[PDB]
Amino acid sequence: SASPAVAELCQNTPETFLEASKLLLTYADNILRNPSDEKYRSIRIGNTAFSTRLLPVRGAVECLFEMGFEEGETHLIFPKKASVEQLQKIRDLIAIERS
């Protein structure tokens, strides 16, 4: 598993890396652990946490794209076609780097 997005995320300062990676794990785990709950498959682009703590961080949105999210006008969406396996892959790579 050699992710360009996770590698880029890891180039951030330790504190910024921790902030963004925490959110990334949360978004993945919410889907992985609640497969029946469609609300976790969308993240609003203007959501305060997302827009201020994730989106500005180098590599972070690309981690979501590698997970399988796609960008819509107002939200990122984890589509019906998206593999849970791939979502899990990136979750695992991030978790290893968080320690």
Side-chain angles (χ1 to χ4, degrees):
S1 281
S3 170
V6 176
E8 179 84 350
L9 185 67
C10 288
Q11 303 316 110
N12 284 292
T13 60
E15 292 180 12
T16 298
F17 169 77
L18 284 172
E19 195 169 42
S21 61
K22 175 69 186 170
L23 284 162
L24 289 164
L25 288 189
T26 296
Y27 297 136
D29 290 342
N30 285 347
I31 292 162
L32 290 167
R33 297 185 193 188
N34 307 277
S36 286
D37 196 339
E38 64 277 14
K39 72 182 182 173
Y40 300 124
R41 291 182 162 243
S42 56
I43 308 171
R44 193 168 72 82
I45 291 168
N47 169 270
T48 297
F50 185 60
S51 65
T52 68
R53 308 201 316 263
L54 192 151
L55 289 180
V57 174
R58 70 185 280 186
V61 75
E62 287 78 21
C63 284
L64 293 168
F65 300 147
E66 293 195 18
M67 281 175 181
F69 286 81
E70 297 182 330
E71 179 158 353
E73 298 297 346
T74 51
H75 296 69
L76 263 66
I77 302 292
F78 187 79
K80 294 189 65 70
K81 72 192 167 180
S83 167
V84 157
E85 152 201 70
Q86 180 61 25
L87 176 58
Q88 184 78 235
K89 175 201 163 195
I90 307 299
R91 192 274 182 214
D92 293 350
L93 292 178
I94 292 169
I96 284 163
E97 300 308 320
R98 282 181 55 80
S99 288

